[PDB]
Every structure is written in C-alpha cells, then in structure tokens.
From TrEMBL, chain A:
Protein name stated in the entry: Large ribosomal subunit protein uL23
Gene Ontology CC annotations of this record: ribonucleoprotein complex; ribosome
SUPFAM superfamilies, sorted: Ribosomal proteins S24e, L23 and L15e
Organism (species): Staphylococcus aureus
One MF annotation (Gene Ontology) recorded for this entry: rRNA binding
Pfam families documented for this protein: Ribosomal_L23
Gene field: rplW
From TrEMBL, chain C:
InterPro entries linked to this entry: KOW, Rib_uL2_dom2, Ribosomal_uL24, Ribosomal_uL24_C, Ribosomal_uL24_CS, Ribosomal_uL24_KOW, Translation_prot_SH3-like_sf
Biological process per Gene Ontology, one example term: translation
Domain of life: Bacteria
Keyword tags: Ribonucleoprotein, Ribosomal protein, RNA-binding, rRNA-binding
Gene Ontology terms: cellular component: ribonucleoprotein complex; ribosome
PROSITE patterns: RIBOSOMAL_L24
GO terms, molecular function: rRNA binding; structural constituent of ribosome
Protein name per the record: Large ribosomal subunit protein uL24
UniProtKB/TrEMBL annotation, chain D:
Name of the protein described by the UniProt record: Large ribosomal subunit protein bL28
Annotated InterPro entries: Bacterial_rp_bL28, Ribosomal_bL28, Ribosomal_bL28/bL31-like_sf, Ribosomal_bL28_bact-type, Ribosomal_bL28_sf
Family named by the database record: Belongs to the bacterial ribosomal protein bL28 family.
Keywords assigned: Ribonucleoprotein, Ribosomal protein
Organism: Staphylococcus schweitzeri
Keyword Oxidoreductase: no
Underlying gene: rpmB
Amino acid sequence: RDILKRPVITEKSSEAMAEDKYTFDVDTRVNKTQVKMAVEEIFNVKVASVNIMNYKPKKKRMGRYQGYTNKRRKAIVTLKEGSDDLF
Amino acid sequence: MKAKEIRDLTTSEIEEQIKSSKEELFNLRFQLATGQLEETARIRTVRKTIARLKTVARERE
Amino acid sequence: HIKKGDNVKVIAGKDKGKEGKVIATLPKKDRVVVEGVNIMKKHQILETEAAIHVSNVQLLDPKTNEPTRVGYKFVDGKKVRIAKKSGEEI
Amino acid sequence: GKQCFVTGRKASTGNRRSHALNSTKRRWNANLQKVRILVDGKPKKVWVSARALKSGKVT
RNA sequence: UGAGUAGCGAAAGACGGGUGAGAAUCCCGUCCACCGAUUGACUAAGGUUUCCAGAGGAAGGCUCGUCCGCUCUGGGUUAGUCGGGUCCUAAGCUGAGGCCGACAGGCGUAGGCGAUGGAUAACAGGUUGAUAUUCCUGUACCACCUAUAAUCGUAUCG
RNA sequence: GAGCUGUAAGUAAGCUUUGAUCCAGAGAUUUCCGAAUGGGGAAACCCAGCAUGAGUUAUGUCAUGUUAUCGAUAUGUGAAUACAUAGCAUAUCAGAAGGCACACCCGGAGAACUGAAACAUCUUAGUACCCGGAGGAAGAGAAAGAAAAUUCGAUUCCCUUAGUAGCGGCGAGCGAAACGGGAAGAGCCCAAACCAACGUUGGGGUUGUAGGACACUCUAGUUACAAAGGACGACAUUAGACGAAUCAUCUGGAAAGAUGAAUCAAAGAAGGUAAUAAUCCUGUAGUCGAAAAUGUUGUCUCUCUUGAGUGGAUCCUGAGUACGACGGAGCACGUGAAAUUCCGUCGGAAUCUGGGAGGACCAUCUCCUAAGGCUAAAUACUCUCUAGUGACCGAUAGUGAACCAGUACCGUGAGGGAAAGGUGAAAAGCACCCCGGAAGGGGAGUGAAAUAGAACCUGAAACCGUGUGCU
C-alpha cells in the first residue's frame, strides 16, 4: 500500500540514481519485505534488492525552547528494469 | 455543517476512496517533495473527502 | 450594527464630524476602518488608512442625515435594522 | 490464616504487667488443634478449637 | 577595598609566501626539536551527533584569533555469512497448585527468565568530503520451496 | 448572520450568504504503553500457537478474530482402590482485580521527643505513621432503658448542667451523665409451638397492659427499611433573542473634564472607548425561548394484601449461651468497697410460681424481657461545576509557580528547588544621507512626548567619572 512517504533528493542519492538505485522514506515500523511489494505494485517494475536503515532524532532549537525532530527509516531500492520513479 | 452529496451504492462507495487515495493523495505528495506542486490547498481538500466517505460507509454498518 | 459598506459619522477623535465609508471590519479587536480617517505615514514613505474603535463611529439616518442608534423590529422571518428617532429601515 | 474453622476464635492483644506496673505488649492465642472432620468431600484437616470439641462434635 | 596586585595548569621553535579592516597565535612551504612496550593502530564500557561541507565572530577558548569539540544552513550510518534475538544452560531472580504468617506479606515444587561460558554458513580487491566482511568487482558457502530425475516400495522418517 | 485558516505576526495557496469560522445536544473514528490479561521484558519493545482471507509456480511476507490467573455454574470424567473420591478436558459469565480528593467515616496494629522543673506509676496519646473495607455520607438505632414523678417512652446533633460529681506517685494532671430548652422524626422482618405435601419446600407466627400455638361466631398499591420487573405531564439544567434616554462651546494629541441647554429610570451594578460617561459600546432592570439529552417530581394503569375481643387443660418464646475463677482491656473512674461490658483459658444455669436491672452484697418494691436481622431525616468534609462576596495581597507581597514551574539546576536513589511582570491611544517599531568590516553613533522623518527606540513608565542610595569658586 502507501508504505512510502517521500523520496530523498540529495547529493549522495543523486549519485545512486545513476545505477538504478532509489531512496525513499518509509514508515518507521515496516520491514523491507513490505517495501519490496509496495514498489512493484505502484510503479510496476521488478525489484532486485532493498537495503534499509534507521536514524535517531536530532536536537533542534528555535528561540529559547529546545525539542527533537522525528525519527525516520530510509530504504534504498535496487531495480533490474524500469526507472524514473520521480521527475 | 458541510456539504455531503454521496448518494452512491455500496459497490461504488468502495471505489470512490481507492481513486481518491491513489492519485489525489499519493501523486500530490511526491510533487511537493521534489518540487512541482503549486496550489497546495488540494491536499487538505482531498483528505476531508476520504474522511467523508468513511463516516457515511460506517453508518451503513 | 456597524457593517461594511455603510456611511458613518465620527463622533470622537481627531477626524470628528467627518463622514466616510467602512472598508474593513475587525470584530476580534472591535475596530473599523473608515475611508479618509486617521491616515498614517509608514516608513517602508506610504500613506494608508488606520483603524478606529467601533464605538467612535455612529450611523446616519437617511431621513435626516443625523447620527442615530440602531434597533431591530422582527417584521418577517428575517430581521431588519430600524433607526431610532425615525422609522426607516437602514 | 490461623482461625477456628467452626467458632471463629483467633488471637488477641494486650499488656503484660510487672509488680511495678510496667507494661509491654503480648498476645493471647487460641487452643487450636489439628483434627479431621467430615465435610461434603474428603475429610480435610482443619484447625478447630477445643471449646468447639465439647457437647459432641464430629471427628 | 586588597589592585592594575597573585595567577594564566609539567615541554622548542624560526623564517618565507598568502588571506584579511586588523596576524607571535589561521592556511601553505622549508629547516629544526619530542614520543616510539607508545604521544602510533584497533577496540569493550560510558557519552549521545561532539562526524562532513559551505558560511559567521556577539558570548565560551585563562592572551589574540580571519580559527575551532562554539554559532547558522544543508548532509552523512545500507549485512542470509560480523555482535545479539527467531538456539543452550551457571550464579541469582521469579514461581501454577502448595506450606507459614495480626494485615501487608515470607518461603518454595513442576515451569520460566538470566552470559562474563557452549553451538553457529565469506574471502580478497576497489571506491567517497563524510560507510564498509554492509556498496561495487571476482570467486564461495548454509537453510528452505517449486519442476523433471538415474535410481525406487519393509524403502523413508522418529 | 460575515468573515475564516489556534499563540502568530510571515508569505503561499484557498473556503464562505446554496449560510464559512464560531456556540450547545447526540453520534462515528480513537496508534503504543500502562491492572495489561498469548509468552517474555531493562514501560511505551521483542517473539508465538489456532481458525478465516489478500498475494506467490511454491516457500518466505500481510490483514481481521481469539488464546492470562482466580471464582461460580452445566457437562465427559480410570487413579492408588471393587465402588467412589483427588486430579484432568471443554463450555458460559458487563463475576473479581487497578486507580482514586494526601478531605470526611469504621476496623486491625500502635511510638517517641515533651510535662511532672530529675524519673519508673501517670502524661504526650489511643496522637503521628502503617494496613484493610466502604459510602455519598458512614457509625448508632425501636429498652433485659432512664428514674423514684400525680412518671417518660427508638437513634443522632446543638445549648446548659459544669470545670460540678468524681479519678489521681490524691502529684503533674484527667473529667462525666441524667433532668430541662431546641433541630429532625416512620418502624418492621425472621427461629419455635402447630397444619398440609414429597429431611425438603409451602402456610401460621413475632410479644411485657404478657404475647403466641390449639380450640371458639368472623374481610390499605407505600419500589428510602417494611416483597419486587415496567408504560404514563409538568418543571429544572445544558446554545440564545429583545431590551429607554444628549447636544453645543473652551483647553488639549485626544473629552467622558469645565461651562450652558435637555432626556430616561421596575434600568444611577460593572467593564471598555485617545483623560473622570445613567443617555458611545458590551451590558443592567424586565420579559421571551429548546431540535436533542439528563435530572426531579404527579395522574391513571400496574404489583402485593387476613382484622379485633373472649378460653389460657396442654405446648413454644434464640445454649456450651448467661454467669464464675485466672490473665488483660474498655467504661471520666489507675483494682479500688467496682456495679454496668468485651477478649483468651478452664468450668458451667434456669424455663412465666421463669430471667435481668436499680454502682460490692442480701430482703422488699419499681422498671424491663439478653444470647437473630433491617431502617430515611436532622450530622461531617470539599478534588470539583455554576453564580457571587471582602475596612484580604499588589511582583522581597499573594500559592513554590501572574512569565512554557514542580520547570533550569542539584543527587545513584528516595528527595530538594529557584530567578524572571509594565513602550505607545494607535507599530504609526526610525524611508533617506554621513563615519565603520561590523556593533555603535550624528542628522532627517513618526509621535503630544524618542533622556518613550524593544537592554523601552517613573528612575532613589552605595560606587565610578569630567569641569570649576575657596584652601
């Protein structure tokens, strides 16, 4: 389903997109077997591998008040056919 | 107080919220990420239609 | 009471006795903006209209053009605004 | 959990007095004896005081 | 007030070229000096973004500072084989029914939890500003499923 | 009934007179932890069984239900041990658990410092702390009573009796009740005799002027006790709507102030508006109003229902109970001449010509009838909601906390704990020029005022500087 949240557009991810790799933001409590089936169901491609990782919340401040950002789970998808999962 | 005009039958109530989430919520949300999306009030409008389609379907029980 | 578009007379302040026309309404802070009243010079120099308290303006009766109070009559299912010391529906 | 199964007798509390009228706390226990008495099922051992063993009680 | 007084926390720096409003103190170069069973290379505990890049000089740095473990913005952690769980138990803890106890509760049987120990399938090379038995290249191993098999049937499995 | 997208300003994109936002009633959704309940665990995490379904050539993955312990009830149900009985398996259960207002109430258990000018009996004190069980109140409650009148008639609370009677190393100290005056105010159900049925369940029966059984003529619903399920109109609360009466001049940046003319009042409470307003605004007095939900009451329906006197041959009226000895406790009362009532141990009655009490005890008189149960009101307290009040505080005060406070911070932990309010009526929050890298400043503008420029109302003293008359 809508496991995916947003795509990741950075300098390192741009170098990944030249070799059939795509970086997304997924839900914090899903495994990469669900992410594998979610990509093929939406974009109609054939996935070959998924690697996934976690980042901790970061300390942030504005004015005097201090808080934390959201924790996130990042998935990198390797395809064997198809591309252009965004513009 | 809002405007509800969903007179559809059950077989058509299910498909209303499959089309309204596949493109009217998921396609509008990747456009805001990479950046192509003007007129951003569409996102909030669609989310309330999904809420409307579920309140009415549940009263049918 | 004082709604946008009406002709009003100022009864207190610097531009007192000067008729105008309400252009903006601020029900939260109880202020109205009247045309040609309390201009300000903002260094951005710019001339714009400032706001005055809603209790500083009074509505004018059409039959005499003298400031009057506003009542309600309950004629039909809807309400109308009557002018005191007169009978005309504002 | 030590009480008479029939009468409901149990321990009390009071004072121990010396000849000079000094006082300390003490307890008055009950003469509970472990006996087998006929109940609806198997006769199980229960605590029964000796006062309840007079005038004829099942054993 | 003491008073512009005590102190500035073990030690070798010198010159040239830059940047800059401002240079004993920042960057580059040369020479010289110190450790080297360690002032070198890994890593457990613990800390929790202090890591990288582009900018900044109010406060912190016992001096200065154009610089930073300090301020702003944007980034970075990828595993069937590595450590741990889907395996095992020591000490200890907890305990169905059970025993004891004014109440609260204490002790304990079968059963569980619990590594500092036992069992357990992958290596070499390359690459980025920030990751590497995790990414890429080449060559392997272990468990399970599906389709046909030479050979099977008192076979097989426990 | 016209703007709105919370602090909060910002820009961007939008909704709304086909009734946005907003206020009230009723619904639907409601991640994870936590009694936490499938198992485990270092809370907010990990790992499963079983039955249905989604997807796949198949495995691997996903979704929706359900699976703790104890207790009470139907059911199958060998043990040892013939029969039976422990154990075992499944089913049903708005059955239990935890939290809570560190207030009020009942019970279990229970100190010390202190006073006695030392201290042991005594006092602090049945207080603090701990544990259990509740309720909106709880506890008590229908005479084996108080007393001594020509008698009253369940319980609780207030006034007085009264610092009296009394208790006390007769020291320090402790300290009542009845009478009388008030608030509030109903009383009832069972066991036994006895009759009918197959030990059982029905009926009969509840007391002191002596009642009941047996035998003699015999018919107000009280759902707060007294027996327990429901349909039946008026109010109250939860959104709101109408609601009288003023103009002119002067000073000022601004009028509500001063000076003249008026008006309203079942409305001269209060708050705001550029300074001090009954008539500018929100209000006030007085009226009006409910889709829907809840509460309290009343009118039929509905549901139970046996009433009093005469006879007393005979029978019944609560047992290891009352009471006694020993050891303690509680009664204002410290064992004292200690009645009255509670616990542990050991003994242990009577039956209406009976039993108890009237402060050891006996006799006579008077009053009552123990050893079963239930019961509203007057009473106590405030975590709270609604509407108000004060010769109470005004930022070192008032709650620790007027401000992002049980927070910064400190400690392994239990736990301890601050400081910090104010521009202006209106941001109109200083366009532009000059010195500088910037901070900072000098003009020019805003404003009544900038020595009101966000380190902002007023701005004291300590302390630090510059310039000057006399020495």
